[PDB]
């Protein structure tokens, strides 16, 4: 499950492709991540003109997990791989202009309505 050194995919365009977890970012003696949860991230695979540098340390929000979400009743819902969206370290919100897949409706519930306000359908 998502912890120290875990590699995640980027669900947004032209910033980065693959990025690494360094904190689950929730206080002391903490574990795991879920939909709409913040994570402390490092850039490991960059884009030739992308506006986030290789080896730099930033924040992201998680949008897909293979362990999935158990909050619904009866159905346990899992998602494609382990994917996140990059966050602006000085102006808040996501930095991408396009985001892949339809995503969950739970991404509105705190700070991340920008994600479903773009091309996603749920």
């Amino acid at each position: 499950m998502i912890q120290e050194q875990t590699m995640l995919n980027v669900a947004d365009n032209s910033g980065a492709r693959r990025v690494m977890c360094i904190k689950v970012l929730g206080g002391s003696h903490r574990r795991y991540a879920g939909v709409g949860d913040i994570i402390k991230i490092t850039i490991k695979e960059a884009i030739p003109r992308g506006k986030v540098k290789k080896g730099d340390v930033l924040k992201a929000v998680v949008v897909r997990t293979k362990k999935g979400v158990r909050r619904p009743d009866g159905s346990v819902i899992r998602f494609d791989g382990n994917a996140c969206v990059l966050l602006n370290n000085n102006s808040e919100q996501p930095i991408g202009t396009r985001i892949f897949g339809p995503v969950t409706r739970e991404l509105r519930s705190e700070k991340f309505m920008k994600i479903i306000s773009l091309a996603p359908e749920v």
Binding site: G74, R78, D80
Partner: protein, 114 residues
């Protein structure tokens, strides 16, 4: 145990169309999301059905659109608008656990040829 099965006679339902693992059931569903209660569809094959009575999951998976797209319809709970048993499989390993290792034409089930 029979003492809670005497209560299960006030929880389960017996009247169902005949279908087994590897069949298509093409259900119409709401998912209970959005104010206008928009009727939607589910696509895929049955991966679990019977024989736990009340606790028989009735699980369906899309299998041709990548990871996820899997839901539990509980056999008896009123959550479906229509159910249509269309395409028939042919199963001798009916758990369908090879669908966790195969993709495409190798994950497609024998055509029930006579």
């Amino acid at each position: 145990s029979n003492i809670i099965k005497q209560l299960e006679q006030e929880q389960m339902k017996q009247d169902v169309p005949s279908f087994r693992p590897g069949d298509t059931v093409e259900v119409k569903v709401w998912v209970v999301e959005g104010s206008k209660k928009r009727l939607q569809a589910f696509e895929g094959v049955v991966i679990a059905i019977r024989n736990r009575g009340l606790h028989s999951a009735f699980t369906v998976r899309k299998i041709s659109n990548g990871e996820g797209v899997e839901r539990v319809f509980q056999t008896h709970s009123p959550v479906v608008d229509s159910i249509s048993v269309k395409r028939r499989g042919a199963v001798r390993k009916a758990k369908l656990y090879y669908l966790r290792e195969r993709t495409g034409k190798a994950a497609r089930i024998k055509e029930r040829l006579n």
